[PDB]
Amino acid sequence: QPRETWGKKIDFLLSVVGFAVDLANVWRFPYLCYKNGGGAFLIPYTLFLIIAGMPLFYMELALGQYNREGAATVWKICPFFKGVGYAVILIALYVGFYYNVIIAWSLYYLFSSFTLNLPWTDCGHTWNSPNCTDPKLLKYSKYKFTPAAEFYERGVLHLHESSGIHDIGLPQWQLLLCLMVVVIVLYFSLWKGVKTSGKVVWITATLPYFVLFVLLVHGVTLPGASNGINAYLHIDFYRLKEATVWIDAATQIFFSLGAGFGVLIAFASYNKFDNNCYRDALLTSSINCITSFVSGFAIFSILGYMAHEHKVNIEDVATEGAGLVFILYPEAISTLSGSTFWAVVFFVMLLALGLDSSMGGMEAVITGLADDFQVLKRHRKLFTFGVTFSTFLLALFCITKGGIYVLTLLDTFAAGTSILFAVLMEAIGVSWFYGVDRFSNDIQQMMGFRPGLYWRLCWKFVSPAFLLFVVVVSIINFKPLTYDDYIFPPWANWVGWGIALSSMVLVPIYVIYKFLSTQGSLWERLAYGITPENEHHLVAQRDIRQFQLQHWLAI
Amino acid sequence: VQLVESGGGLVQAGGSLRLSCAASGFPVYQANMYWYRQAKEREWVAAIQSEGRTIYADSVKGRFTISRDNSKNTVYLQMNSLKPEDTAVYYCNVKDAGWASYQYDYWGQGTQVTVS
Ligand SMILES: CCOc1ccccc1O[C@@H](c1ccccc1)[C@@H]1CNCCO1
Ligand SMILES: [Cl-]
Ligand code: NA
Ligand code: NA
Questions:
Q1: Distance, CA of A193 to CA of B91 (rounded, Å)
Q2: Exposed site from A109, A165, A195, A455, fewest CB < 10 Å?
Q3: Where are the alpha helices (DSSP H) in A82-193?
Q4: B44 interaction partners in chain A (CB closer than 8 Å)
Q5: Ligand 1 pocket check for A358: Cβ under 6 Å
Q6: How many domains does one find in chain A?
Q7: For residues A15 and A265, what is the distance between their CA atoms, to the nearest angstrom?
């Protein structure tokens, strides 16, 4: 059976947007903008989007659209690099092992939102410690004795019952049920392919923007919202002289766009050959970054409201990550008129933000491994069930009582240096070994124009250089594993490094396997490993372009 | 899906030759129809795409004209000012039939074109 195409281009576009835009855009980018010079932070961020993020996004979309393969089997163009695709698939599975747990947290909060008295508004619950204090009497974000912080930690995480990652306890049945619902939704969104995934993203990718619009219109009218917005966009150009600001912008671009993660390649593998993936790459990257910028306005409207309610400054309330959306935002919601409506819409928005990114991540695995194995391709429902059930079982660790520690370890070591290395290897294998000139010819075959010298330069030198810089800083600026005041044991750090290395060693391991499993002399084996599999009849003729300097000097 | 190529033969340098691609099993008017040649590796020649856009390889641009007849479900390749370097077996290819379709990537058996 031939591979199906997207039922519509809107299906593909919304799948790409849904994967790209998630809770990161909302809970990481605004805080980075506020902490890294406000509107000045947009200069490194926009520059990196232009020079690395957009070029990589374009590269992966064009690669998927031309080769019509997943992350692993797209390396028929450079056989030695199939380990890179295997590493990307492994990283996607690893990331899903903990990302769906944050989705399950959003689902738990949404279920808890179906009340006129939100559980995070007052103390006096079973999960409340005697130190719980009415927040109207009170860094604020680090105060753990508020109804919202205590609700999160003790009635959602039950983290008070785990002393560390050495004793994580058993999975929590409420979070277990929420994870079951999340994985069932993922299965029935993924089991019948892109034909139904592309229609599910009509809701999961567009609902967040409606919710964000209503949140913005309400936030701008809140007392103190203007002060929060001013703090958000206060331009400090002297912050651009610090390497930390540029490192943060580069890391945010790389980990928000998701280029080279195996998802864009899989999505473009279902495109029509005529599709203009250049326009789609530009549009979707711009949408991701503009969504982050616009969501920062709502985030900091609420932050300014909270700072005005507690008579504190933005620095005291300003926070990021799960803490923001699960403590600070619920607390603000509990003080609003119609707090139930706001909680429901906010957590529906979090669910929509996370669900299509989980869809994209699991589609990466499913497409990549179905392209590699025909049994998996002809059994999509069974293989999707296998993937989702494995994700559920291995995410059961992150919904234990000490599941936040496992989640921290995974969020640190599953797609960090490992995914950065995998994407750098992809960029090298495409723009140097396969050839940026060959890639441009492939793009011309589909769109009738070759990419301009800008894109070829970015693919061969800038995006590889950006990725190398980000890997080097990720390794250099590694901080030992910690969660709040908890410091993980050394063996936890070793386990995290092993998780990081598990996918990264597949690249050299596959190169060694391919070299040893290919018959011939050393040069014949190298030629077969760098030559596209449909050109291996030329290796006998001793016509290998990678063995000439014109190939490597070809920009 | 089936693709039958016809129109190839022996032509003189600078001569004209029209290849035909009779398609069955799909509508060519919404399909990405590609022409390739193999004298060497298979080389993309021209394409008439889902929305009717005609694109050509640099080697043949200005000399070849790809066109389709919706009524006959046939794609044509009008090869003008042919040169000996154009001697090859020309393959008609359907990449897909649009969006709500399948990636057929079906190839014809090829039509031999010889110049001079
Ligand atoms: C690793 C492939 O991407 C994902 C796999 C599973 C769930 C979510 C995934 O995407 C998100 C993510 C990737 C890596 C690490 C953490 C989270 C985000 C989703 N927005 C685009 C960037 O990737
Ligand atoms: Cl972002
Ligand atoms: Na993102
Ligand atoms: Na998303």
A1: 31
A2: A195
A3: 82-112, 147-150, 173-190
A4: 445
A5: yes
A6: 2
A7: 12
Cβ A265 under 6 angstroms from ligand 1:
no
What would the two tokens of residue A487 be? 């410091």
- CB-CB neighbours of A377 under 10 Å: 16
Q: Which long-range contacts (CB under 8 A, 24 or more apart) does A485-493 make?
A: A486/A164, A486/A405, A488/A164, A488/A165, A488/A405, A488/A408, A488/A409, A489/A164, A489/A165, A489/A166, A492/A165, A492/A405, A492/A409
| Structural domain boundaries enclosing A526 | 518-555
CATH classification code of B2-99: 2.60.40.10
Q: A445 — contact with chain B (CB < 8 Å)?
A: yes
Residues from chain B that touch A535, judged by Cβ atoms under 8 A, are 41
Q: How far apart are the CA of A357 and the centre of ligand 4, in A?
A: 4
Name the residue among A272, A444, A447 with its Cβ closest to that of B99: A272
Residues of B with CB under 8 A from a CB of A: 32, 34, 41, 44, 47, 49-51, 53, 55-57, 95-96, 98-105
Specified resolution (Å): 2.5
A549 and A488 share a domain? no
Q: Domain of A312: which CATH number? A: 1.20.1740
The structure's method of determination equals cryo-EM
